[PDB]
DNA sequence: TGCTCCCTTGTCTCAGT
DNA sequence: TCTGAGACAAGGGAGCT
């Protein structure tokens, strides 16, 4: 996600109760959810199968809800976001190809994005194979993510829903200037810019209207003792905490390579509409009888009701 | 003073109402008024307001002779070398000076005037050796005053107590501090403050980066002084399994240390800082001071000059006042 | 290879002391 | 060369007048 972005983004929220979502094809991000169940989970190290557990809850959550879930995986990793983070726990195939065979069971249907995994639901909803998007991560506005289903896996009567419009409407913001400020705040495709937080950051892309601007501003005061003698309480502070900050804004700033990657990500195309099953209560006792040691009977008290 | 100590100190308050200072002798550390008034009243344009040393003793004196208090003003004589090295590192380090790798003055002229209106007001006062609030302390400690009004928190390191603070904010009460309820509150005695200031930093000392109130008081009342502390840090340096037999605070602690870059070297702690503290220059003279009383005829002049005001300006103040 | 929340700290600026 | 409070931001660790 873009740093601090869900803190700015927050009051345009709107609470939907879960019953509202009956039926609604949803795509979920289901990117880091291993990473983050092994992390999350642990004992007195981490916990055996959490993956397995963790998936089947939010499952069962989902079709409580009557909710039909398309579940989607990261690809690779784009070379800037590599870059990025190059600045004890890992993920075995093992546990996707589990994972992915329990969804099979549910008769979920899921995919693997070519890349990221916000990238491909945002293009799943631009293409109308869902009707919303179930994530926590505030990049998938920035790939052009709209009707975002935050919060889903909180112990809640509700979810927070998200829209472009409402922020456009709300914070002034639209696709291009999200994707300035990631240039600011920082995100996975680029370190932002030290000492500049969410304030600040909104108050550059609204004063400057953009990165461009603020830049031309920034180096043309530093060259001209004259045009800082005339300048404001918000420029005058800005370029004292962007010079001690260090800052230098060159020929690469905004960067052209950071607003690819949003603008274009690498993603699939495909129109094929997805394919909803039926859970299979046979294949899903002897599934999680064999990973977790349920009896058929654990099982099908939590199932039963499900179908 | 030392960085945030009334933060620390602060709940060991007791708020006392001025009309309970009635008759006290209370030294009075005058020692940046001038300098405040400077820089702290200002002119539409920006510049400073003329006279507003006068203008700014003035009203203080009145609030303190309102209360019937019986002041006595400090003043500093000299400026350890210490404290003005320290000084200019920080006036250079705020005006933007990179101090890593990449990645308006007070006269003589004012000090006269403030101290001819002292006079005329019958008011005496001294000019320390060197620091104000180590006299301050050193008055008290002989009787010569029951109490000492200041800001400044370096007063309890040159061993003050009895410290009467914010007496000048414009409001009700003021605040009443001293070392005991400190070292039975706190746990923190003379010592304990002078070890504080090199973790947090004084006019004495550039302290720890790193280190604020809540990490500092800790790290005193862990280690018990900064030498266990420097021995402390050294010796688990390269014990990987010690470092594992670390418990939360010292684990979190060392790692901060390190993120910060910080180096405890020969002169930690530091002889100099301790001396300066503990063995200040201060005036051992025994002499009661000698309150007198305000001078009318001479202060209408004094203020008719200074600021223009005629004389029944000055009377409808000062004569309530005597 | 994660996250948000809370705690602590650094830095700055305006108004007051 | 001041003080004091508040606003903003960086970073770490725990627990999911
Ligand atoms: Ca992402
Ligand atoms: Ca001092
Ligand atoms: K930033
Ligand atoms: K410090």
Redesign the interface.
């Known amino acids: 996600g873009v740093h601090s972005f869900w803190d700015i983004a927050g009051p345009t929220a709107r609470p939907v109760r879960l019953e509202s979502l009956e039926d609604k094809r949803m795509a979920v991000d289901a990117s880091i959810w291993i990473y983050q169940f092994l992390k999350a989970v642990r004992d007195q190290n981490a916990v055996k199968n959490s993956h397995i557990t963790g998936f089947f809850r939010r499952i069962c959550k989902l079709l409580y809800f009557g909710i039909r879930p398309v579940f989607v995986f990261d690809g690779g990793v784009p070379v800037l976001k590599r870059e990025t983070i190059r600045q004890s726990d890992e993920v075995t195939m093992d546990m996707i190809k589990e994972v992915q065979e329990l969804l099979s069971r549910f008769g979920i249907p899921y995919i693997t994005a070519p890349m990221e995994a916000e990238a491909q639901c945002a293009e799943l909803l631009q293409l109308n194979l869902v009707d919303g998007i179930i994530t926590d991560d505030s990049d998938v506005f920035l790939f052009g993510g709209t009707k975002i289903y935050k919060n889903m896996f909180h112990e809640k009567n509700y979810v927070e829903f998200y829209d472009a419009e409402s922020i456009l409407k709300l914070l002034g913001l639209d696709r291009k200037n999200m994707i300035e400020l990631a240039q600011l705040l920082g995100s996975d495709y680029t370190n932002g810019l030290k000492g500049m937080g969410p304030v600040s950051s909104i108050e550059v892309i609204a004063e400057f209207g953009n990165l461009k601007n603020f830049k031309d501003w920034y180096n043309n005061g530093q060259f001209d003792k004259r045009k800082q003698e005339t300048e404001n309480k918000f420029e005058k502070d800005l370029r004292?905490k962007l010079?001690?900050n260090?800052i230098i804004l060159d020929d690469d700033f905004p960067s052209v390579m950071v607003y690819d990657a949003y603008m274009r990500p690498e993603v699939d195309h495909d129109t094929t509409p997805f394919v909803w099953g039926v859970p299979d209560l046979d294949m899903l006792r002897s599934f999680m009888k064999t990973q977790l040691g349920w009896p058929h009977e654990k099982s099908d008290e939590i199932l039963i009701p499900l179908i």
């Open positions: 004292k010079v001690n260090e």
